[PDB]
């Protein structure tokens, strides 16, 4: 960090962002110098791991669209509808295989990352 800046010199560092870290990026890097108020460079974001396994499709892949709509009807056959979810929740069901170097990677991937946000590719949209 200690770095002398020549006059009329711009020093552009290479901020390399790795792929390993907490799922929530809450960083506050402080550039503190004498005779100058602290100039903190705040880096914010999230870390995610993408699902990179191609699932076998001999059995059809099932996509489920679900929404909530609680409806109450009176004694007469009249219904009032109160659709709750504007964006239906999407669920995907599929089967897959892993033999040569994908089985161990899958085991480690579901071991370390476990239950956390993925980046699921849309297989039907290949």
């Amino acid at each position: 960090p200690p770095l002398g800046f020549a006059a009329l010199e711009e020093r552009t560092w290479t901020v390399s962002i790795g792929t390993d870290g907490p799922p929530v990026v809450n960083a506050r890097i402080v550039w503190r110098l004498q005779g100058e108020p602290n100039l903190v460079l705040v880096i914010t974001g999230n870390r995610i791991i993408a699902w990179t396994f191609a699932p076998d499709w001999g059995d059809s892949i099932v996509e489920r669209l679900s929404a909530s709509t609680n409806i109450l009807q009176s004694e007469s056959a009249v219904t009032q509808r109160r659709a709750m979810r504007l964006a239906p929740r999407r669920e995907f069901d599929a089967n897959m295989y892993a033999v040569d170097r994908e089985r161990q990677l899958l085991d480690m991937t579901l071991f370390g990352w476990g239950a956390r946000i993925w980046a699921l590719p849309i297989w039907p949209d290949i």
Partner: protein, 147 residues
């Protein structure tokens, strides 16, 4: 109405009339002298119905004059011996703006209940989730006579 915002009406509480007092005693204090005084509100018809006499005592120490006590006692007898019908209806969002004590009309032809004036009681509503708005109402029989 069933087609105008009423979902289901369960309770009716038709009540009974053979019970209930036939004589009402009202006790009040006169502010001129501060001495205990009382008046009697009588129910001749229900008394004839009653084979055994009955009476209750109600204290209205806030009343400073006998005539006012008599008026309020007539109102109380009116309420207690007119046979109120208490309904527990279920309503949709159409009953969202109602407030306690607000009177409104209800009609349900299948139940054989004609247009009736009722006053809102306990209120329980669920805007998010079940969507159930349930109200407890009573028949409108409240009135304070001026004589």
């Amino acid at each position: 109405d069933e087609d105008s915002g009423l979902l289901e009406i369960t309770q009716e509480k038709t009540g009974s009339t053979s019970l209930a007092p036939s004589q009402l005693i009202v006790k009040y204090i006169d502010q001129i002298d501060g001495a205990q005084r009382q008046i009697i509100v009588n129910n001749n018809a229900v008394a004839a119905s009653q084979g055994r006499r009955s009476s209750e005592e109600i204290e209205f120490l806030g009343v400073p004059t006998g005539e006012l006590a008599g008026r309020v006692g007539e109102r109380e007898m009116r309420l207690k011996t007119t046979g109120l019908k208490r309904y527990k209806g279920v309503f949709d969002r159409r009953a969202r703006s109602l407030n306690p004590g607000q009177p409104f009309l209800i009609r349900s032809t299948p139940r054989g209940i004609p247009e009736t004036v009722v006053r809102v009681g306990r209120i329980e509503d669920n805007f998010l989730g079940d969507g159930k708005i349930t109200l407890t109402v009573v028949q409108d029989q409240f009135n304070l006579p001026a004589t």
